[PDB]
Amino acid sequence: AFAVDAAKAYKDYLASGGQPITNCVKMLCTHTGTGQAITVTPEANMDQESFGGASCCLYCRCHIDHPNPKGFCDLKGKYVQIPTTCANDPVGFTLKNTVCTVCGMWKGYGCSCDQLREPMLQ
Amino acid sequence: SQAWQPGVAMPNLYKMQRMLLEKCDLQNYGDSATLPKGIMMNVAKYTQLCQYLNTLTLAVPYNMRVIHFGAGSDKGVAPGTAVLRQWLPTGTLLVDSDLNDFVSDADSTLIGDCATVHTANKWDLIISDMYDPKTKNVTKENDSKEGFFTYICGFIQQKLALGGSVAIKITEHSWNADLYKLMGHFAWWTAFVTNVNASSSEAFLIGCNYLGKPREQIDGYVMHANYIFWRNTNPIQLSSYSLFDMSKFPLKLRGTAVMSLKEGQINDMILSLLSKGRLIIRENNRVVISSDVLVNN
Ligand SMILES: Nc1ncnc2c1ncn2[C@@H]1O[C@H](C[C@@H](N)CC[C@H](N)C(=O)O)[C@@H](O)[C@H]1O
Ligand code: NA
Ligand code: NA
Numbered sequence: 349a350f351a352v353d354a355a356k357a358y359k360d361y362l363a364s365g366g367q368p369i370t371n372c373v374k375m376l377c378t379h380t381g382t383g384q385a386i387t388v389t390p391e392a393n394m395d396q397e398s399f400g401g402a403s404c405c406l407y408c409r410c411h412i413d414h415p416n417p418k419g420f421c422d423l424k425g426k427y428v429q430i431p432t433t434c435a436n437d438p439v440g441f442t443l444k445n446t447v448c449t450v451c452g453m454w455k456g457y458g459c460s461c462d463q464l465r466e467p468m469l470q
Numbered sequence: 471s472q473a474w475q476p477g478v479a480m481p482n483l484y485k486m487q488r489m490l491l492e493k494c495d496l497q498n499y500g501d502s503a504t505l506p507k508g509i510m511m512n513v514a515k516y517t518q519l520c521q522y523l524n525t526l527t528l529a530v531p532y533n534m535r536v537i538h539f540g541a542g543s544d545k546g547v548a549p550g551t552a553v554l555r556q557w558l559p560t561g562t563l564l565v566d567s568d569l570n571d572f573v574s575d576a577d578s579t580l581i582g583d584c585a586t587v588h589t590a591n592k593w594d595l596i597i598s599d600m601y602d603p604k605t606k607n608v609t610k611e612n613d614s615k616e617g618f619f620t621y622i623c624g625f626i627q628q629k630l631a632l633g634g635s636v637a638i639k640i641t642e643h644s645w646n647a648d649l650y651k652l653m654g655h656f657a658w659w660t661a662f663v664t665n666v667n668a669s670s671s672e673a674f675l676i677g678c679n680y681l682g683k684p685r686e687q688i689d690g691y692v693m694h695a696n697y698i699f700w701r702n703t704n705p706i707q708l709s710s711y712s713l714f715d716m717s718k719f720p721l722k723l724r725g726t727a728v729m730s731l732k733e734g735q736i737n738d739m740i741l742s743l744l745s746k747g748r749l750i751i752r753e754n755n756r757v758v759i760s761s762d763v764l765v766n767n
């Protein structure tokens with residue numbers, strides 16, 4: 349029944365003033381991308397930074413199993429877009445946030461699926 | 471002038487000289503370029519290498535196979551691998567390797583001496599950033615180095631598809647005479663210096679379109695002396711300018727033809743297609759790789 353909870357440990361570590369994981373690999377890009385959360389190539393917009401996925405994954409960086417039956421990673425081999433305001437802690441951002449399964453944008457940082465219906469535009 | 475280029479390629483005239491080896495003394499030594507905010511030196515370096523490789527006749531087949539040696543870092547991540555995966559088409563197989571453990575974006579990662587890496591398949595592109603830490607620590611007469619370079623020479627002669635290309639990192643002291651000789655087994659080759667690291671004797675030996683035989687006999691000791699003469703007499707201004715325009719960065723997916731021809735079917739017409747980056751010769755079997763594990767108590 350025992351199971352190590354790395355996510356909780358990193359969050360408590362940050363709340364205690366712990367220094368965020370460093371050396372996340374920031375990529376050079378045009379910053380004119382789609383702004384989607386996790387992509388096959390850097391897609392940062394003007395308000396995001398693109399990073400190599402594996403370097404922003406707590407499980408990959410801590411060398412511990414991924415929390416799912418297949419042990420599959422959704423960041424490794426892809427690029428993660430992080431809001432510039434949160435680019436100082438990409439590992440913490442990917443843990444505390446969720447990608448919208450509909451538009452592919454971060455919930456609360458791009459996903460507009462829950463905004464009131466806009467009046468139709470010609 | 472060349473400050474807006476990703477870097478500088480050794481002019482062809484240097485390859486035809488017979489220079490005597492001597493110390494590499496760079497005028498722009500100690501200096502450093504202005505790196506974009508939060509960008510690692512190796513992300514900048516690989517980005518400029520890839521920007522230059524875009525100007526060459528690289529074969530880019532569907533299901534391209536790329537292997538990256540010396541992909542690890544003391545940071546435990548793979549900056550160069552992240553750039554290669556950004557640069558290469560989405561359907562490209564990318565395998566990386568390093569002596570020390572690291573976290574990577576590659577499809578597969580092998581940990582251990584490159585001499586322990588085995589593969590039953592041929593590759594379309596070989597990138598190497600391997601560098602022995604003792605090369606700096608201990609000083610030695612500047613002779614040809616025979617550690618991981620002997621493995622790279624063998625890997626090129628047995629696991630590189632005809633039409634394939636390589637980019638092998640060298641420095642004043644980290645070089646190999648046999649590797650320079652193998653540059654003569656490509657349709658074309660050069661020594662490329664990234665503008666962001668122009669204050670270093672580092673260069674990437676680029677072999678473009680492997681022919682599996684020598685089109686030119688190259689004396690490696692003389693060619694490294696020619697390379698140092700170029701670095702000592704043509705100062706390269708440090709520059710990060712090419713890093714700010716990434717609009718044409720992705721390698722264009724040419725869909726280069728892949729054929730499994732016999733060694734007896736390689737005629738002059740085939741050599742001509744290989745030389746233009748219009749043909750890759752190798753089988754297209756299951757890509758299988760492994761790293762030997764030394765067993766002991
Ligand atoms: N014989 C060898 N086999 C495999 N890797 C080696 C060997 N000798 C040196 N290396 C590696 O070469 C690497 C040199 C580094 N500068 C590579 C940096 C890396 N390319 C990056 O993207 O940051 C080190 O990580 C070494 O462990
Ligand atoms: Na890509
Ligand atoms: Na191993």
Ligand SMILES: [Zn+2]
Pocket residue numbers: 402405406407408409414421422423424
């Ligand atoms: Zn992971």
Ligand SMILES: [Zn+2]
Pocket residue numbers: 448449450451452453459460461
């Ligand atoms: Zn949404």
